[PDB]
Structures are given as C-alpha cells and as structure tokens.
C-alpha cells in the first residue's frame, strides 16, 4: 500500500505537541549530541512538560505554543530523509498516556503471559466488531478502551436483542410446529403416526432447547475478545502491504480519541 493511502487513513486521529513562534519543534538535549521529538496523545502531557520547563527555564516556557496535528504530516516526515532537515541523533518518539497502556498490559497479562512492559502505542479492537457502511463493513480502531467498549456495548445490546427476538421468531414458528404434531398425536388412531410424530416432537423441542441454550449462552459467553497492539507496528505493517494483506488493511481505519464518549 502506497504512502498516500495511509496518509489519508490516519488523518482523523490527531496528536498534540508544542512548537515555537518560529514554528519549530521543541526537543530535549542529552549527552553526546542527542535530541528527540515527542508527540503526546493527550495535550496535558506536553503542557506538564513545559510546566517542568518553567521549573528551569522561564524564557522557553513563555516561548511555547500548543500545536495539534494529525498523524498525517508526522508520518510524512517519518517517510523522508531525516538528515535533509538536520539529523545527527534526533529520534522522534511517541508518548502514550499511562492509563491506556495500563489497560493494555492488563489485557496482555489476562491472557496468560504476565509482564509489565509494552511496545508501541496501545491500540484496541474487538472480535466481531466492524462498522458497516452503505457499501462495506470497515473495521474501526480504538486507541481508547472506554470508547471501544462504549461502541461494543451498543453493538452487543443490539445483537443480543436481535437474538432474543430471533428466538421469539422461532417461538412463533414452533408454536405452529407443535400445532401440527399435536393435531395428530392423539387426534386420530394411534400406532405408526403417534410414534413418528412424538419422536418428531422430541426432535423439535430437544433441538429448540439446545437452541435457546446457544442463544442465551451467547450472552453468558464472555465479552467478545478484545485485542491490543502497537501503533508503531500496525503502521509499519500498513505501509509494507501488498496482496492479501492489502485487502485486509484496506478496510481498517482509526476512530478519533474520546470521540464516541461525547
């Protein structure tokens, strides 16, 4: 998949950083000529960073302005020669909030392998969940487990209600069913037909009982499996796709953070 596709697909999700009045990024100096860029999914993180700047530099703390851009042009600049703009140790990194990475790691270790370290930026998805359009059913990607499960609860309620009224549909069909079975179980002379038709009744109602078992066990089945991944990896996979994974990635797109809530 060419880079223009991902530049169009990653646009809805923003990210906050800080620039100068000269429209220049702020960085953190270290040892032996190192600097690095940052991108905070919640602007309060950069605001706290420059509140720490005010702790040691009042000039730079007055010289700040808060910028909000999508991942569009930062991914663009990732796909560029970094030494064209000047690079001898400037490593742009991301900085996710600790809330969602903690939810991510609890997801991680409620699977069976308990660790306390993470790679990338935490993305969430749900099994069975896919937003359908007038034409196709695209997959929405949630950086926020809250928004994820707010969509998932609506979808779960509507589907399990569809299932309860589906079993009411089969309740209609089966009140009609026992009607014929009862209409000759003892209404005529018994023998062949009584045996055959009450074996038919056993058939029908043992099947419909296992059916309702399935229907409500679907609700007694757990929350559809929620998965967490790294934004770094899903993006570098989106970029280097061709063939089957092409049609796979071509229908996944990312929702805005804290959009589904309010």
Per the document, the length of the chain is: 262
Contact 174, 204 (CB under 8 A): yes
Please list every residue from 132 through 171 that binds another protein, using CB under 8 A.
Answer: 132-133, 135-140, 150-152, 154-156, 158-159, 162
* Binding-site member from 14, 43, 69, 118 for another protein (CB under 8 A): 118
What's the farthest any 2 CA atoms get from each other in the chain? Answer: 103
Candidates 32-40, 174-182, 185-193, 208-216; binding stretch for another protein (CB under 8 A): 32-40
* Binding-site member from 15, 71, 181, 228 for another protein (CB under 8 A): 228
230 binds another protein (CB under 8 A): yes
Query: What is the three-state SS of 136-195?
Result: CEEEEEECCHHHHHHHHHHHHHHHHHHHHHHHHHHHHHHHHHHHHHHCCCCCCCCCHHHH
Q: What angle do CA 169, 171, 175 make, to 5 degrees?
A: 125
Candidates 54-62, 179-187, 192-200, 202-210; binding stretch for another protein (CB under 8 A): 54-62
172 binds another protein (CB under 8 A): no
260 binds another protein (CB under 8 A): yes
Closer residue to another protein in complex, CB, 98/182:
98
Distance, C-alpha 90 to centroid of its chain: 31
- Find the shortest distance in angstroms from Cβ 261 to another protein: 10
Closer residue to another protein in complex, CB, 148/197:
148
Nearest to 101 by CA among 81, 121, 76: 121
* Binding-site member from 72, 145, 234, 257 for another protein (CB under 8 A): 234
Candidates 166-174, 178-186, 206-214, 221-229; binding stretch for another protein (CB under 8 A): 221-229
- Find the shortest distance in angstroms from Cβ 58 to another protein: 13
Q: How many CB atoms lie within 10 A of CB 233?
A: 13
Torsion angle (degrees, nearest 10) of CA 160, 164, 169, 173 = 120
184 binds another protein (CB under 8 A): no
**CA 228 to CA 248: how far, in whole Å?**
18
Closer residue to another protein in complex, CB, 187/259:
259
67 binds another protein (CB under 8 A): no
């Amino acid at each position: 998949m060419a880079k223009d596709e991902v530049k169009a697909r990653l646009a809805p999700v923003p990210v906050y950083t800080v620039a100068n009045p000269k429209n220049e990024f702020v960085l953190v100096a270290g040892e032996n000529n190192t600097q690095l860029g940052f991108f905070f999914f919640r602007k309060e993180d950069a605001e706290a960073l420059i509140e720490k700047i005010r702790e040691e530099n009042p000039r730079l703390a007055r010289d700040s302005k808060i910028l909000r851009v999508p991942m569009d042009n930062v991914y663009e600049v990732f796909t560029t020669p970094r030494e064209q703009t000047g690079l001898q140790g400037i490593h742009f990194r991301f900085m996710p909030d600790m809330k969602q990475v903690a939810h991510a790691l609890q997801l991680y270790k409620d699977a069976g392998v308990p660790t306390r370290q993470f790679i990338g930026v935490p993305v969430f998805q749900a099994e069975g969940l896919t937003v359908t359009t007038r034409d196709m059913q695209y997959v929405p990607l949630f950086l926020c487990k809250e928004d994820l499960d707010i969509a998932v609860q609506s979808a779960y309620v509507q589907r399990n209600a569809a299932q309860i009224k589906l079993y009411k549909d089969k309740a209609d069909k089966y009140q009609a069913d026992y009607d014929q079975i009862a209409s000759q179980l003892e209404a005529a002379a018994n023998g062949r037909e009584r045996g055959g038709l009450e074996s038919r009744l056993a058939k029908a109602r043992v099947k419909l009982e296992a059916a309702r078992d399935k229907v409500e066990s679907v609700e007694r089945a757990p929350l559809p499996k929620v998965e967490v991944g790294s934004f770094e990896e899903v993006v570098m996979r989106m970029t280097a796709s061709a063939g089957n994974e092409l049609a796979a990635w071509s229908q996944v797109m990312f929702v805005a953070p804290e959009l589904l809530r309010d």
